[PDB]
Amino acid sequence: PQITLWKRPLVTIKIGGQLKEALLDTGADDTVLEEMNLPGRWKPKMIGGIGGFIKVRQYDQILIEICGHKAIGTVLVGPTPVNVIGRNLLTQIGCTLNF
Amino acid sequence: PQITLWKRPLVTIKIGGQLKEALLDTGADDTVLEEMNLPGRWKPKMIGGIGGFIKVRQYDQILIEICGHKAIGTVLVGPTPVNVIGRNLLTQIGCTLNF
Ligand SMILES: CC(C)CN(C[C@@H](O)[C@H](Cc1ccccc1)NC(=O)O[C@H]1CO[C@H]2OCC[C@H]21)S(=O)(=O)c1ccc(CO)cc1
């Protein structure tokens, strides 16, 4: 599809057997999802943006379906106000910016 | 152009007659630039990011050229970690997401 940017580019994702809403975010290097109790090992990470840093849990090789497009990669879990799909997964679904 | 996302979508912008580098950021509603001098009236505002809220100077109706494409709109200036071009200006240059 083609998504215009008049409104936030929110899409439905499937991760860990749950459906959620997330931003297709070209400004995020990596994917960050709202707190959720995922099984498996993780490592702590600090990620920074406007307002400072938050502590997150880095899970590797997580399967995520984004608008019916499957991807697998790093997913950071923490107290983010928004689910954001970052470039590490956007590249996997064939997403480009165009103007 | 069509921009892939294996690297950060960084582009050169012109604002206040000066060249800078900025990130095309579909996850940003607004455009936020690092501390700089800009002419004209500004009003204090607050904006929230992943890590909390920051004080910014809001400049309205500012000319800004993004990768050769002209826009006129609101630019927020403050202690952002990165110059981000947000949806208020991405829409003006006709930017869409595609996959
Ligand atoms: C700043 C940028 C370089 C990096 N960020 C992505 C941005 O898209 C961020 C997304 C966002 C955060 C919080 C609420 C809504 C959207 N948008 C944002 O701050 O937008 C500001 C300006 O416009 C307003 O609209 C929405 C908020 C206001 S990040 O989240 O900090 C981040 C940092 C490290 C990683 C791991 O690599 C992943 C993500």
UniProtKB/Swiss-Prot annotation, chains A, B:
Region Dimerization of protease, annotated ranges: 1-5, 49-55, 88-99
UniProt-annotated catalytic positions: 25
Domain Peptidase A2: 20-89
Subunit relationships: Homodimer, whose active site consists of two apposed aspartic acid residues.
Protein name: Protease
Lineage, opening ranks: Viruses, Riboviria, Pararnavirae, Artverviricota, Revtraviricetes
Span within the parent record: 501 to 599 of 1447
